[PDB]
């Protein structure tokens, strides 16, 4: 079950700088990574930010992360119409020895 | 008128405190292959007339056995396994109480990869790293010393050792019948070196020594004094039997290059505590001769026993070294009764097992007992305890003996008791009659 | 009678046992302390060696020496001691002051040899 | 590059065990990465079910899974193999192989230590289980 | 009438054993000869006329005591030197690429600070390296990684056996036999005592002696029981037989710091071409050496059909010939040298394919491994062989002809060939004899 | 001759040099020739000892006040000194060696007491 | 006609080295003083006349034997202290909150060896170099291992007798003005030297023994332009020093039970290490030491240089000041010159530097703990460790520069007045004693 | 007076003083140390003691012998080399050959001599 939270929808309109949050415990968003994803309609996810705000390779300056003690939140500015999708957070979690990912952000 | 004369090799000595070599009759922690093989014919010569003073607590002798001790111990354990990679945090949950089936994932040979283990470890030798929190247990000792396997190889069998002067000196022996400790000792015996002594550690309760002659007697460098240990030597050995029924079947695993890690993989049975047996019939009637003896020292007050003095495990339980393990018996069920002037059974003893000990009392260092494979059972003789009188306050009518002592010097003394080393001084003078020619 | 078999036993019985008292004077942890054991007994030894040649006794189990008894020492005759003394207490007797009388000998031995080679 | 593509039965009866499995291409199954799997049941939150070191070589599994599933690998054919014993109608859900590197995280003189599974570099194309009579 | 006198300084002796200690010809020599007490510059050789002594190199615990002496020098040397612990590592090794021997081994490697991690692409003898996973490939575990760590060996230090001469205490004496053609025992008639024995090059080798002291004017056959299959023969020349090694591969060493402040050395390209190593010898002699072991082999169990195979077979330290020359490890496959028949009746040189080993347990222990660091340049060796150690195995009943393996599986075999000469005697000074004198009172 | 040379040599004469056999008798490698050099003053000792008891210190030839014991040997004095060496000569004595020590022992104790008196 | 005769005992010596065994006076010390046999108690000064005996400090095997004996016991009482590996990863450092000063931080172990701990550690710049150009990394990680000085064993120099076996005399050489090597009288024999002080320094040596009435020069070719000339100073000329930061020590667990000590705070501002001497002393000790060099060599002209040149360890002052180790500037020192005809405080400046290799080893690495609070540390200088620097003949003047590079010197100008010999008691001369029979 | 005080004294006077120079005669890392220095002074003393045993000397200071005085030796006279010449110069001028002259004594005299004795 996820252990993190996150809002279950944030949808609007596009042209802005909408912040997606995402909150846990000691146990996994305030001990490591804080990686991000993001989840197409009817496909598997992908890769958006890793560790906690580096960027992997393919993925445009668009996006970006941040960290602050046991919350969490992306930022993200200048949005498209491609942008209509489930982004999750995700983090080790060191009391349950495994990942676990947010209830999903629905943009 | 009368000159002086000077003798050469007169039968004199000097007490005197001098380095002892050891001597037995590989395979063991005492690594007594490396010892001089003693003379099978005891060399033991008789002293007439003689009447030497002797001491043993003052005895040097104790001392250097006690750090030998600790040395062979030391170099036993030297070229073994260095556990220092269990400093990991352990995952334990309860076994499917006194047991855990901690979790976590070790450093294979090749560095690169590691490998996931489940062990069971005592509550004794696991604390938790949160406090209250469960889970997140981690091995005790890992904030004080480096934890250190004894190789499976080397056993703790308390084999013989005798305790050898070299040349120049010799050791006296006290043969009187019911020696009172201190005294001067009427029928003495010069023997070249100490006859074999079993250095099994144990504490609260001596095991495996040398039994009285004829009665109990009791040894105190000052009995009134509370703080000075009361070493007791039992006449009638006491048999006691324990056993850990737990089948324990035993795992190996290869952590860093060539050093193995031996643990508690699965028991298979029923899971039960270990404990230690005692005839009631005889430990009782023990008591009452050791109460009867007692009253001769002190006047006519009764004499009652407790349950120890309470605090850490390691001095205020019995520990024996037995089977390859190592054992933390609670013995408040021996001294719980009261004596007076005018005065199926076996006693139950219940028994905590302990792999991470710390033997001689020494922060910085650490010692891990691998698990034996199957159960193991162990019968002994007691021949020996140590008390302690709780005589604090000014009691009239009362006098409360408590087991401790807490000095492991103890366990020795009560064996080297009829030792005494002494340096030769075969150079005299004396008047003499006579003038040397030109 | 055996080593140091005659420690409690008169002067004169025990001045007869001497030869036996003085000639039984002869993984790495042991071998270190069995080796500075050993040499700690060839040491000892040597100790009372060296004392046997300065002062003109070499290799001599009974000795003579040109240095008179003084009372001050002891004040008892030649029969008690030498048939009712043992040699243990005795030794406590002279337990003070017993290097007065070592280096009296050594003394006296030193002027000794030399008066000879001036005679010869 | 690495590509992850699952294989299995979509429709699976309940009370028995759910077996399918995962082709890797493009890497050496016995890398430094972890092969993990993931699950998404119908527009619902993403959960982690466990983990085979392809290093390492040795499973993990989530506490509240770790009696039902045992992940095995196969080094000879380069596929990991999920084993869902005694599935039921709650576990329906998109399974997705993913990946994750075990990045080192300091050394020591007994051994090194690196990061648990997390950021997931690749994802599998996903395959739809659904448990019913 | 007689009476007992002693005498002292008497000159008689006893069999005994006691310990010794060396001394070396006038720091970085792993035998610490330079720590060793200088030897003395007058061989003071005393001659025993009309001794007559018995000698029995096979019950003697000179050679005892002497492989105990050499393994603590192995070790007390190694004990300095960088611990290998950090190579124990998957390795991702490939076929060399410029004769399938060498692997080029690419593997993650830790670096001074203990937060960083080095990529080292080195070239390890396929000997060295254990496939991790039998099945697949380009996994291979450095050997010896499941049994204990490596210790590297020094670079600065060498290997070379330079003479050391094994004296004994004063108030001992150690005997040297001198007859002309004395087998291993045998009651010795131009006996001869010396402070202590002469240079004795520790050399180590396997199924043959390099650089060893020979014959005098005929071979020599030693051993406790001849006709015994399982005791070992070793066999002494009168005329060695010399054999040059080389290592064909150039190789390039490199060096990168592991750890604080600790060097790791290895191979890091072989420039040209990539040749295995081998060791020649003249067939010529080899051939006349053997014709005359055979005639003599021949001598002390009669005249049968004497064969030579090639090994009794096993691992390669006890199957194949090892050296020490160089700072490197060879391991020989001496087939050739031992594939000859010869009855009563009876350019040009032999080729021995030989194979380099970096990890080795030189003295057959499992406890201990360490790793030899390549040497840079084409190393060359050359080398004397004057003695064989031999073992039949006939265990069938020999009818007509049986065949000599070489081998022995024991390292104490080829340090007895220099030790047949000595035997430790405890002189006793004192002695008791009759004689008509009486001492005055 | 040297150290030791005279062994082969006819027992009467190979006893006119004892004198250079007696002045022969006197950190892997350091405690190795340590363990080893304190052993020859030990060997030293153990038999320069007993002449230090037996009246014959600093004395090459020592005779004593012992009758021989035909028991020991029956050969005569003759055959002795003149045909065999040292080498099998202990090897027939071996056997009352030690006892014939201390015989010399009590001997010598009981001429210091006699000539402690008697003096 | 004469006989030859033999003596035992006679009074006669050899020149021949020996083993030699220290005596404290009577555990926690890095010399194991405790451990050393004691010293007795009244050390045996007897008097000799008429030996006129030769002495030679640079060609006696003693002062090696010390420097390889001290080095010992160093490692002796360093090994078992913990042993801080885990302390070798990368660093990062900016500016503390002062040039001298880097507030670094890092991960270390804590007690759990899957667990690390972020520290604030303040490491000066001489033990910290870039890994590239933030990352800094510590000094001397790349040549040996880092070992933490136990806190329980101070560097305090106490005395130390050295000692010979028994048949093995140590002379003692008392004349006036001893230069060195020639012929020493009133040669005195003791058991064993006297207590001398193991003291760390370099370029100037600390609370050793002065001269009795005038300033002493000496060398082993006081002509050569190579060699050390070691000044021995008629008086002490007093030197203060102290550390202004008042630092603040911070303790935490590292692997198995070990602990380790870092400068966690500085409390005020932050001041540049000193020391002071009097202007007045300094510059007539110097001046004294020009009049007593006028008449060994030189065109009458003395000229005092600030060092030759080199790393921090011998061109710069060493100290050892209740645990701490200080490396100042001797610039100030040697910055005058003169001439036949001839507050008030010199001031060195110096740098705090905790990582070091004092005996000049590269395989080994001391990390000295910082020590709460200011520290202070008063001595004596008794001696200086000179060296000309001719490189073209003397026409008019030459050059004096402190230094040598050298740590036995500091040694020599210590048992200089000490020569072992061994006693050899057996000898022969002609008589006519003859032997009866 | 003390140890080794006659060092720089008459011959005469160092010929009476020779007893006490006889009797003087004889944390890890304290401990080879003192071992190995304490196992040479017994070497030491041992060196030169064994020497006086096969020449016969055993506890005599001023021992004798019966050997010849060889010229080639000393071109000197009795009178003035003991009248105010010291030991040491004295002996740094004879340690030219000293193993010779230990040979005469050693056994062209201690030697020879007990076996002439022996024919009693
Ligand atoms: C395979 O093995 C590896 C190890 O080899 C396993 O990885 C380890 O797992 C554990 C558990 O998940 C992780 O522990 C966490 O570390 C966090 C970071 O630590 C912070 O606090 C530290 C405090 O240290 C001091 O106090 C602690 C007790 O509080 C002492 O134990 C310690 O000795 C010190 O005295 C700081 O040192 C550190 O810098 C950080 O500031 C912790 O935050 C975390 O604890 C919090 O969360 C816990 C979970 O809820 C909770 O229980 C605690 O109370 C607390 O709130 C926890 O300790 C290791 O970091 C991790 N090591 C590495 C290197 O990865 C791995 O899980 C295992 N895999 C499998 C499959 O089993
Ligand atoms: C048997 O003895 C021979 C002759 O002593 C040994 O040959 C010598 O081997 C060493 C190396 O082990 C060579 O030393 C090196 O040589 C070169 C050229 O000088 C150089 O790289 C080094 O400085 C070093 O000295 C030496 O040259 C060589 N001598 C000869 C004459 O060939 C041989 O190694 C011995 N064999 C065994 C198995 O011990
Ligand atoms: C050896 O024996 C012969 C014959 O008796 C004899 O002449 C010769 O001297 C002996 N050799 C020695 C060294 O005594």
Known sequence: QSVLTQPPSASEAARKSVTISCSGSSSNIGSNSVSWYQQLPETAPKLLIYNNNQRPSGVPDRFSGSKSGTSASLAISGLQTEDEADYYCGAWDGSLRGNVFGSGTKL | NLWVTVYYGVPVWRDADTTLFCASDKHNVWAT????????????????????????????????????????????????????????????????????????????????????????????????????????????????????????????????????????????????????????????????????????????????????????????????????????????????????????????????????????????????????????????????????????????????????????????????????????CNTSGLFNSTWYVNSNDTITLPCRIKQIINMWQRAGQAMYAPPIPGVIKCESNITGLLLTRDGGKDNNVNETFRPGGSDMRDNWRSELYKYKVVEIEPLGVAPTRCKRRV | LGFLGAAGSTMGAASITLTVQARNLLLTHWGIKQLQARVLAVEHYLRDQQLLGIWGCSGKLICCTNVPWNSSWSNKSLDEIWNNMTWLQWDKEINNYTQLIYRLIEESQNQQEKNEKELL | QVQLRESGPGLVKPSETLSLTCAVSGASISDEYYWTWIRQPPGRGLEWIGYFSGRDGYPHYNRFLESRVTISVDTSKKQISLRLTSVTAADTAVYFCAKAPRSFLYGDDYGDFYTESDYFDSWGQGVLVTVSS
Request: hydrophobic residues 35%; contains cysteine; proline residues 5%.
């Open chain 2, 33 to 328: 292959h490396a010892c001089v093989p003693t003379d099978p014919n005891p060399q033991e010569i008789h002293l007439d007339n003689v009447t030497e003073k002797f001491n043993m607590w003052k005895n040097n002798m104790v001392e250097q056995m006690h750090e030998d001790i600790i040395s062979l111990w030391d170099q036993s354990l030297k070229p073994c396994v260095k556990l220092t990679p269990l400093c990991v945090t352990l995952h334990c949950t309860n076994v499917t109480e006194g047991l855990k089936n901690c979790s976590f994932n070790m450093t294979t040979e090749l560095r690169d990869k590691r490998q996931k283990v489940y062990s069971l470890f005592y509550r004794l030798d696991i604390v938790p790293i949160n406090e209250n929190q469960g889970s997140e247990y981690r091995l005790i000792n890992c904030n004080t010393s480096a934890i250190t396997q004894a190789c499976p190889k080397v056993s703790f069998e308390p084999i013989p050792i005798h305790y050898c002067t070299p040349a120049g000196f010799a050791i006296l022996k006290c043969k009187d019948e019911g020696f009172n400790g201190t005294g001067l000792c009427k029928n003495v015996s010069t023997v070249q070196c100490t006859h074999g002594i079993k250095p099994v550690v144990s504490t609260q309760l001596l095991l495996n020594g040398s039994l009285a002659e004829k009665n109990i007697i009791i040894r105190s460098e000052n009995i009134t004094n509370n703080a000075k240990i009361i070493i007791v030597q039992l006449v009638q050995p006491v048999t006691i039997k324990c056993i850990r029924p737990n089948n324990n079947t035993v795992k190996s695993i290869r952590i860093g290059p060539g050093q193995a890690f031996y643990y508690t993989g699965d028991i298979i049975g029923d899971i039960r505590q270990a404990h230690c047996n005692v005839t009631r019939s005889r430990w009782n009637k023990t008591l009452q001769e050791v109460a009867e003896k007692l009253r001769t020292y002190f006047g006519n007050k009764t004499i009652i026993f407790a349950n120890s003095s309470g605090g850490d495990l390691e001095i205020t339980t019995h520990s024996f070294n037995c089977g390859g393990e190592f054992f933390y």
